[PDB]
Curated annotation (Swiss-Prot):
Residues 17-328 form the Peptidase A1 domain. It is an enzyme of class 3 (hydrolase). It catalyses: Hydrolysis of proteins with specificity similar to that of pepsin A, prefers hydrophobic residues at P1 and P1', but does not cleave 14-Ala-|-Leu-15 in the B chain of insulin or Z-Glu-Tyr. Clots milk. The keyword rRNA-binding does not apply. Transmembrane segments: none annotated. Belongs to the peptidase A1 family. The active site is at D35, S199. Keywords: Aspartyl protease, Disulfide bond, Hydrolase, Protease, Signal, Zymogen. This is Endothiapepsin. The gene is EAPA.
């Protein structure tokens, strides 16, 4: 089997991407944030504290003839940005782009933190990291991809995120029309539960490539590109007036600037992020100071190839017995 679904930016900055997902019988369609950095499929629901729902579409398990309460199961998750959610668990039928999993754990939120409430466009998350990170207790549950894998034509999914435009998540096949050149595959460590890999270096604008190993995670759920302080300083030094602002929480730059591109290495291959992908707009409405899309990972403890990087590529998440990642230009 295969599936194919369009993923759409939530706003004009590509702060996140939402993909429609069918849950239950009859189907209830919710728009979920597909997150290769976590492993829980959780939804706003008829059980979510009413004051914490503000415009989201909710899953109502009592209206699904295939929903079953997973007796005794609870979940609770905290994300890298400080947001969180928790609740109980059902199993139900879940379909993405024509690919159906029966018996998928659907984690129903009883509580969500303010950042989730305040984002009316995101109805929940669909985790695509390794199932070892799933938070359900006392019996850990599998991701949608893990459940689907054996049925897929090939045990892969691909992320093709757009810059200020829709893109595609495919399951079970590689669309050879969606990229240019070849796909370069690189080794993955699953030891921390992430799609963790090592980039071979970077360049800023038209500058020379610096060969240096950068270990980090391919994370569709994270908006920005988080890299070591040395790399990030070298990038922003090429932007007149850019500076790190402790009050704002990272590098800012004059909105009048023209940003240089940023290149990262994948083996001997190179992925070029155009400068305008690094512009996240005014820090507050009407400001002429703009927020940068490349930020330091110092203090995070891990480098994160988030959407800023991934949207410059066609990315293969290969879930073969030994997982690997593939990157192509497009």
């Amino acid at each position: 089997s295969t599936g194919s679904a369009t993923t759409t930016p939530i706003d004009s900055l590509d702060d996140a991407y939402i993909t429609p997902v069918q849950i239950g019988t009859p189907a209830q369609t919710l728009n979920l944030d597909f997150d290769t950095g976590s492993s829980d499929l959780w939804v706003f629901s008829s059980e979510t504290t009413a004051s914490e729902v503000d415009g989201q579409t909710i899953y109502t398990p009592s209206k699904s003839t295939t929903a079953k309460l997973l007796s005794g199961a609870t979940w609770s998750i905290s994300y890298g940005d400080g947001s969180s959610s928790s609740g109980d668990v059902y199993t139900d039928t879940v379909s993405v782009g024509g690919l159906t999993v029966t018996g998928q754990a659907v984690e129903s939120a009883k509580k969500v933190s303010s950042s989730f409430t305040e984002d009316s466009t995101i109805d929940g998350l669909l985790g695509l990291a390794f199932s070892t990170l799933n938070t359900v207790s006392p019996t850990q549950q599998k991701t949608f991809f893990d459940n689907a894998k054996a049925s897929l034509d090939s045990p892969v999914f691909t992320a093709d995120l757009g810059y200020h435009a829709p893109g595609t998540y495919n399951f079970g096949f590689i669309d050879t029309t969606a990229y240019t050149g070849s796909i370069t595959y690189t080794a993955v460590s699953t030891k921390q539960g992430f799609w963790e890999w090592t980039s071979t270096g970077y360049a800023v604008g038209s500058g020379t490539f610096k060969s240096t190993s950068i270990d980090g995670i391919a994370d569709t759920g994270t908006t920005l590109l988080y890299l070591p302080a040395t790399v990030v300083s070298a990038y922003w030094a090429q932007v007149s007036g850019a500076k790190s602002s402790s009050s704002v929480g990272g590098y800012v730059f004059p909105c009048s600037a023209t940003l240089p591109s940023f290149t990262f290495g994948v083996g001997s291959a190179r992925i070029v992020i155009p400068g305008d992908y690094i512009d996240f707009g005014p820090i507050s409405t009407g400001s002429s100071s703009c927020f940068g899309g490349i930020q330091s990972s110092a203090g995070i403890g891990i480098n994160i190839f988030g959407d800023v990087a991934l949207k410059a590529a066609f990315v293969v998440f290969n879930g073969a017995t030994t997982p690997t990642l593939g990157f192509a230009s497009k």
